[PDB]
Amino acid sequence: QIVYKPVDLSKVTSKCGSLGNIHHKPGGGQVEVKSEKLDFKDRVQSKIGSLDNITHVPGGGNKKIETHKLTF
Amino acid sequence: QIVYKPVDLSKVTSKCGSLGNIHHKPGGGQVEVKSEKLDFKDRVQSKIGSLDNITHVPGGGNKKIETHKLTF
Amino acid sequence: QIVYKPVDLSKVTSKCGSLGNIHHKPGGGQVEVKSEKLDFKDRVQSKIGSLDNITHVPGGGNKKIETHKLTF
Amino acid sequence: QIVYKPVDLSKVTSKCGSLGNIHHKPGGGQVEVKSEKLDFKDRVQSKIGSLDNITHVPGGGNKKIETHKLTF
Amino acid sequence: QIVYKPVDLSKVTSKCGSLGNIHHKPGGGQVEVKSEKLDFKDRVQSKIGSLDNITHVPGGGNKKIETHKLTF
Amino acid sequence: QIVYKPVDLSKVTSKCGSLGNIHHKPGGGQVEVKSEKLDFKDRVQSKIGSLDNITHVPGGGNKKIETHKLTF
């Protein structure tokens, strides 16, 4: 007999009064990559040769992550 | 007999009165990479040759992570 | 008989009156990497040759991590 | 009685057997300048706030400069 | 009586068998300048706030400078 | 009576068998300058706040400078 019965009533919350006046200003750059062969198998995530700029300004941006597992 | 019955009532919380006047200003740069062969198998996460800039300004940005496991 | 019954009532909290006037100003730079062969298997996380800049300014930024395990 | 009679018979010369395989590769950068007032008079040469790249490969590039003056 | 009669028969010379395989690779950078007032008069040469890169590869690049003056 | 009669028969010379395999690789940097007032008169040469890179590879690069002056 198994009674798998977890209970969650928890909270993740925020208040912010004002959000702004943010400046992101990159000055370029240079990237070089050389290879002869690539061979990727079975759940590969790959990034080769990048020059990436990100500005991320969510009003909340809170995260909650859950995982339930039962195995025989 | 197994009675797996955890209980969660917890809180994660924030208040911020004003959020701003943020300046991110990078001055370029240079990157070089050389290989003969790449060979990736089975749950590989890879990053090769980057010049990446991030500005991240969440109004909350709080995190909660939970994990429940039972095994026979 | 097993009675796995933990209880959580905890708080994680912040108050901030004003957050700002932040300057991030990197002065470039240079990176070089050389390899013959790369060979990655089974749950590899890898980063090769980078010049990466991050500005991270959460209004809260609190973390809570939990893990429950039972095994036979 | 002034006899002003300079004589020039001189030479400036070069040989180069082969000229090439030159790589110029700049990685960005950042420049900022602030002023309230500017006031320039009478033979001013000025340069304010620059990010300049030059490649100069003349097959000779030899120079000769002469100046003759007589004054009463 | 004045007899100003200089004589020049001089030589400036070069030989170069092969010129090349030159790499110029700058990694960015950052410059900031602040002023209230600038006031320039009468034969001023000025440079304010720069990030300048030069590659110069003349096949000869020889220089000769001459100056003759007579005054009463 | 004045007889200003110098004679020049001089040589400036070079031989080079091969010139090359030169790498110039600067790693960025940072410069800041602050002033209230600048006030320049009569034959001023000025440089304020710079991050400048030079690669100079003349095949000859020889220099000769002469100056002849007579005054009453």
Author numbering:
A (entry chain F), B (entry chain E), C (entry chain C), D (entry chain A), E (entry chain D), F (entry chain B): 307 to 378
Provide excerpts from the study.
The assembly of tau into amyloid filaments is associated with more than twenty neurodegenerative diseases, collectively termed tauopathies. Here, we describe twelve phosphomimetic, serine/threonine to aspartate, mutations in tau, which we termed PAD12, that collectively induce the *in vitro* assembly of full-length tau into filaments with the same structure as that of paired helical filaments extracted from the brains of individuals with Alzheimer’s disease. The tau sequence ([Fig fig1]) comprises an amino-terminal projection domain (residues 1-150), a proline-rich region (residues 151-243), four microtubule-binding repeats (R1-R4; residues 244-368) and a carboxy-terminal domain (residues 369-441). The tau folds of AD and CTE comprise residues from R3 and R4 and the carboxy-terminal domain.
